[PDB]
Swiss-Prot record:
Purpose: The production of the second messenger molecules diacylglycerol (DAG) and inositol 1,4,5-trisphosphate (IP3) is mediated by activated phosphatidylinositol-specific phospholipase C enzymes. It is a crucial enzyme in transmembrane signaling.
Annotated compartments: Membrane raft
Residues of the SH2 domain: 21-110
Gene it is expressed from: Plcg2
The protein's name in its UniProt record: 1-phosphatidylinositol 4,5-bisphosphate phosphodiesterase gamma-2
Coiled-coil region(s): none
Top-rank taxon, per record: Eukaryota
Subunit structure: Part of a complex composed of EEIG1, TNFRSF11A/RANK, PLCG2, GAB2, TEC and BTK; complex formation increases in the presence of TNFSF11/RANKL. Interacts (via SH2 domain) with CSF1R (tyrosine phosphorylated). Interacts constitutively with THEMIS2.
Length: 124
C-alpha cells in the first residue's frame, strides 16, 4: 500500500498492447481452446509470440479455429493483403466492416472477462 501523486503518466504509442482483446502471455494451447469455448460464430483474438516481430490472430470459423500470420511493412502492420494500418487497432475496426474468412467478421473480440463469465457461476 503506497500512493501519492498521479495524473498523466508517460504516453503509450502502443494502444494494441492496452486493448482488452490483446494477449501477451497467451499461447496456442489455450488461444485455440478459448475460441472453441465461445458459442459465438465470429470471435477473434490477437496474441504475441516471442522470437520475431510477427504476430498471429486466432479466430473461430463456424466452429473450427484458424490463424492468420501478421507481418510488418515499414513501421506498419499487414494482416494478409495490401492493408496498411499504423496499428492493429485500426486494422480491427477496418475489418469489422468487411469479412475475414467467408461471410463472418470480427464481431466478438474474445476477452479475458468473457471466458470467466462463460465459465462458472462466480469468478474471484
Amino acid at each position: 500500500g503506497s500512493s501519492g501523486s498521479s495524473g498523466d503518466p508517460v504516453p503509450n504509442p502502443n494502444p494494441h498492447e492496452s486493448k482488452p482483446w490483446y494477449y501477451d502471455r497467451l499461447s496456442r494451447g489455450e488461444a485455440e481452446d478459448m475460441l472453441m469455448r465461445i458459442p459465438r460464430d465470429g470471435a477473434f483474438l490477437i496474441r504475441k509470440r516471442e522470437g520475431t516481430d510477427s504476430y498471429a490472430i486466432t479466430f473461430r470459423a463456424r466452429g473450427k479455429v484458424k490463424h492468420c500470420r501478421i507481418n510488418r511493412d515499414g513501421r506498419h502492420f499487414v494482416l494478409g493483403t495490401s492493408a496498411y494500418f499504423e496499428s492493429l487497432v485500426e486494422l480491427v475496426s477496418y475489418y469489422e466492416k468487411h469479412a475475414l474468412y467467408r461471410k463472418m467478421r470480427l464481431r466478438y473480440p474474445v476477452t479475458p472477462e468473457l471466458l470467466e463469465r462463460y465459465s462458472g457461476p462466480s469468478s474471484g
